[PDB]
Write an enzyme that holds these catalytic residues in place. Structure first.
Site, PDB file in Angstrom:
ATOM      1  N   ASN A 164      51.815 -22.919  40.078  1.00 34.86           N
ATOM      2  CA  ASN A 164      52.729 -22.351  40.730  1.00 34.86           C
ATOM      3  C   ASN A 164      54.118 -22.444  40.340  1.00 34.86           C
ATOM      4  O   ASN A 164      55.334 -22.243  40.719  1.00 34.86           O
ATOM      5  CB  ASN A 164      52.889 -22.309  42.096  1.00 34.86           C
ATOM      6  CG  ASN A 164      51.394 -22.089  42.790  1.00 34.86           C
ATOM      7  OD1 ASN A 164      50.928 -22.836  43.618  1.00 34.86           O
ATOM      8  ND2 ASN A 164      50.884 -20.986  42.301  1.00 34.86           N
TER       9      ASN A 164
ATOM     10  N   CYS B  26      61.473 -32.190  43.028  1.00 40.10           N
ATOM     11  CA  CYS B  26      62.260 -32.091  41.788  1.00 40.10           C
ATOM     12  C   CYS B  26      61.960 -30.739  41.186  1.00 40.10           C
ATOM     13  O   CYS B  26      60.898 -30.400  41.205  1.00 40.10           O
ATOM     14  CB  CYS B  26      62.028 -33.234  40.703  1.00 40.10           C
ATOM     15  SG  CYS B  26      62.535 -33.016  39.266  1.00 40.10           S
TER      16      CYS B  26
ATOM     17  N   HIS C 279      55.869 -25.486  40.212  1.00 35.19           N
ATOM     18  CA  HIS C 279      56.461 -26.711  40.883  1.00 35.19           C
ATOM     19  C   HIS C 279      55.938 -27.981  40.240  1.00 35.19           C
ATOM     20  O   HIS C 279      54.794 -28.100  39.748  1.00 35.19           O
ATOM     21  CB  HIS C 279      55.986 -26.711  42.096  1.00 35.19           C
ATOM     22  CG  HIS C 279      56.313 -25.494  42.817  1.00 35.19           C
ATOM     23  ND1 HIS C 279      57.810 -24.984  43.326  1.00 35.19           N
ATOM     24  CD2 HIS C 279      55.668 -24.718  43.636  1.00 35.19           C
ATOM     25  CE1 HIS C 279      57.912 -24.024  44.004  1.00 35.19           C
ATOM     26  NE2 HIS C 279      56.608 -23.627  44.078  1.00 35.19           N
TER      27      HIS C 279
END
Ligand SMILES: C[C@@H]1CN(C(=O)c2cnsn2)[C@H](C)CO1
Ligand SMILES: C[C@@H]1CN(C(=O)c2cnsn2)[C@H](C)CO1
Lengths: 264, 263
Positions: B185, B222, B187
Site C-alpha cells: 500500500n 515515516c 507505506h
C-alpha cells in the site's frame, strides 16, 4: 528443493509472501532476484558444496560480473512459482548460471535469468582465469551439451553497456546499506544494487509501467561504510533507461545497467 | 499452513533462507518479524478476510501501537520453524495478536511475540476506540478465555518506555527508506523501523552479543520521502534505550529498548 532425475539441474517451489509484493500485489524484481540466489545456493549444497577443494586451498571465490533478468508475469501474492536452475563452464573465463521461472499451475514460463560469475582472490580482490584443476572439479555437475536460458542469436543478455554521461536526467543521492542489506559474510547483498539502480527511476514510470528486462554489470563492491549515488537517463510504448551507481565521494564506478519497461 | 482443529489459532512452517540469515548463519530479528507479519496475514485469509464489513464502510484500519519479541534460539539457515498465531480483543482498547515460535524437529519453544493493534481512520489518521459493531464481527475468530504468550503479571511486554534525552550515546543519521521498505500500500512497513532502531547499536555489541528482547512503541508513520535519525544510549547482559525521530523537525516516530546476552 530437488535435483532433476539426471541431476544436471535443480527445481524449487516458492509461495509469494505478503511482504515480498508491491503496489500491484505481484512479486518485486528484488524478491525474484532473492529467490534466484536462494535456489542457486540450495543447488550447490545438493551436489555436496560454491567453494571447491582446490578453491578453498587457494583462497579464491566466485563473484558476479553480470546479472540479466527478463520477466513476463510477476507472480501474484500467494501463487506458487517453480524455478529450475543449472550452471555451465565458459571454459576458462568463469561459469554462467541460468534460471527459468514457471507458474506451478499452468507450467507456462513467466521469467528467465542468466548471470556471469568470475574467479577472484578473497584477500587481494584480484580476478584470474579458471585453473583446469578447478574446472574439472565442477564439470561433473554441469550439462556437457550447451543449455541456454537465452539462446537467441541476438539476445539483449550479452549486449554491451555504455557509461552514463553527466548530467544524469534522474538521480537518488546519499544511499547507504543497513545490516539487513548485508549477506552472511557481511558484504553488501548483490540484490541491493538492483534496488539502488531502481531508486533513480521516477515514481510515475514505476506507477504506469512494468519492468520487463534489467541488465546489471558489477565493477567494484560497495562496502558497509560507503555511500552510493544512483544516476538514470531515458534512451527511448516501451521505455529504456541507462543506469550508473558510484561512490558519492570520488565518483568511483561500482555498477552500470539498462532497464526496459512497457505500459500496463 | 492451516487453522488448528478448533479454528481459533493458525500454524505455519518456514525454511530459513540463505539471504534471511546474518554473520552467525541464524535468522535476523527482522526476518523473524517478517515471518510474524506473513503468518498474521495467512491467518486473516484463512478465516475469510482484517478490515471487517464496517472497517471499510467506516474507512477504519488496524495500526501497530506496540511490538514485543523475545528470542531464545535464532533458527539456523536450513532449519524449519513452526509459528502459531492467534488474536484476542483487549476491550475497546484495540486488539492483541500473539506468536509462539517452535523448533520443528524438537517441538521446543525458541521465541514468543505479542503486538498491540488499535483502530484509526486511514484518511484522517485519527486514533479511535473499537466499537461494538466491529467487536461482534471478529470475536468468533478469537479464543474467548484469555491465552497469552506473555501471561506473567507485570512483565517486560507492558513496561512503560521513556523518551531518550540528548545527547544520545550513539546515532545513525540520514536513514531513508527505498521501495523494498514499502509494503503493498506504499507505506514504510513495521519491520523497517526495527532495522532503523538496531542501526544505532555499535557493531562490536552486535558482534559479541545476541538480541534476546526488543520492545518498540510506534508513535507516527515515516513517509516514503521522510528522513530518520536513530538514537541509542546504554542503560545497563546489555540494555539500551532507543528513539527514532525525523531528521528535520525532530518529531518522534518510535521509542524502544533492547536486551542482549553475551554469546
Ligand atoms: C553445479 C554447481 C554450480 N556451481 C555454483 O554454485 C556456481 C554458480 N555460480 S558461481 N558458481 C559450481 C560452479 C558447481 O556446482
Ligand atoms: C483471526 C482474526 C485476525 N484479525 C486480524 O487481522 C488482526 C487485527 N490486527 S492484528 N490481528 C482480526 C481483526 C481478528 O481475528
Amino acid at each position: 528443493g530437488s535435483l532433476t532425475e539426471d541431476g544436471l539441474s535443480y527445481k524449487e517451489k516458492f509461495v509469494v509472501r505478503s511482504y515480498e509484493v508491491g503496489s500491484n500485489k505481484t512479486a518485486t524484481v528484488e524478491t525474484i532476484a532473492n529467490l534466484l540466489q536462494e535456489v542457486g545456493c540450495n543447488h550447490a549444497q545438493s551436489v555436496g558444496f560454491a567453494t571447491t577443494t582446490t578453491m578453498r586451498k587457494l583462497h579464491l571465490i566466485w563473484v558476479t560480473a553480470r546479472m540479466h533478468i527478463e520477466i513476463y508475469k510477476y507472480p501474484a501474492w500467494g501463487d506458487v512459482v517453480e524455478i529450475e536452475t543449472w550452471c555451465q563452464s565458459e571454459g576458462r573465463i568463469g561459469t554462467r548460471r541460468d534460471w527459468i521461472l514457471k507458474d506451478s499451475v499452468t507450467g507456462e514460463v513467466t521469467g528467465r535469468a542468466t548471470s556471469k560469475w568470475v574467479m577472484m582472490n578473497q584477500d587481494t580482490r584480484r580476478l584470474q582465469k579458471v585453473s583446469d584443476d578447478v574446472r574439472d572439479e565442477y564439470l561433473v555437475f554441469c550439462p556437457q551439451e550447451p543449455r541456454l536460458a537465452f539462446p537467441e542469436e541476438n539476445n539483449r543478455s550479452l549486449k554491451k553497456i555504455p557509461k552514463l554521461e553527466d548530467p544524469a536526467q534522474y538521480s537518488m543521492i546519499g544511499l547507504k546499506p543497513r545490516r539487513a542489506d548485508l549477506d552472511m559474510n557481511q558484504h553488501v547483498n548483490n540484490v541491493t544494487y538492483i534496488g539502488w539502480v531502481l531508486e533513480s527511476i521516477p515514481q510515475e514510470i514505476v506507477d504506469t509501467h512494468e519492468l520487463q528486462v534489467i541488465t546489471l554489470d558489477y565493477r567494484r563492491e560497495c562496502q558497509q561504510d560507503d555511500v552510493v549515488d544512483s544516476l538514470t537517463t531515458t534512451t527511448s510504448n516501451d521505455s529504456q533507461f541507462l543506469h550508473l551507481l558510484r561512490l558519492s565521494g570520488d565518483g568511483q564506478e561500482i555498477n552500470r545497467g539498462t532497464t526496459l519497461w512497457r505500459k500496463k
